[PDB]
């Protein structure tokens, strides 16, 4: 999921360290405020998509 299609790695993190922290602030904090408890996280059928 990195930008460089040429540069892939096994274990090296290409995103910054704050990239992961900003995610949990979004989904766990802003999302319950705007959903007010009506939202879900669904598994994906990529074959049918």
């Amino acid at each position: 999921t990195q930008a460089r299609a040429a540069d892939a790695a096994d274990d090296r993190p290409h995103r910054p360290a704050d990239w992961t922290v900003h995610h949990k602030i979004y989904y766990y904090v802003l999302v319950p405020a705007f959903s007010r408890g009506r939202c879900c996280t669904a598994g994906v059928r990529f074959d049918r998509v």
Binding site: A3, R4, A5, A6, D7, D47
Partner: protein
């Protein structure tokens, strides 16, 4: 010709040789009762493996036919250029309208 109510007949090349316009209709004109007596050897879910190798291949056959319709798609991101040492690498946010008049 591929038949969508038989599993062991659906391959990629039987789909790729058909155009993407008629590929919509052939899955829309199959039989609602499926024949299961001749299954695909890699599982029935393995029949889904080959067909999404098949539509993705026929995207390119649609892509060649509109190469006279769009321009050349440049690299999107930096770090990919030939002479990076006297001038740097850009990358085009593919946001314009590629259209050949």
């Amino acid at each position: 010709a591929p038949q969508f109510h038989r599993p062991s007949t659906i391959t990629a090349d039987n789909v790729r040789a058909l155009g993407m316009r008629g590929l919509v209709l052939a899955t829309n004109n199959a039989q609602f009762i499926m024949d299961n007596s001749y299954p695909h050897p890699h599982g029935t879910q393995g029949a889904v493996r080959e067909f999404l190798r098949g539509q993705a291949a026929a995207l390119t056959d649609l892509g060649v036919t509109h190469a006279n319709n769009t321009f050349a798609p440049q690299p999107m991101f930096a770090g990919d250029a030939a002479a990076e040492w006297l001038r740097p690498s850009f990358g085009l946010k593919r946001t314009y309208s590629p259209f050949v008049v």
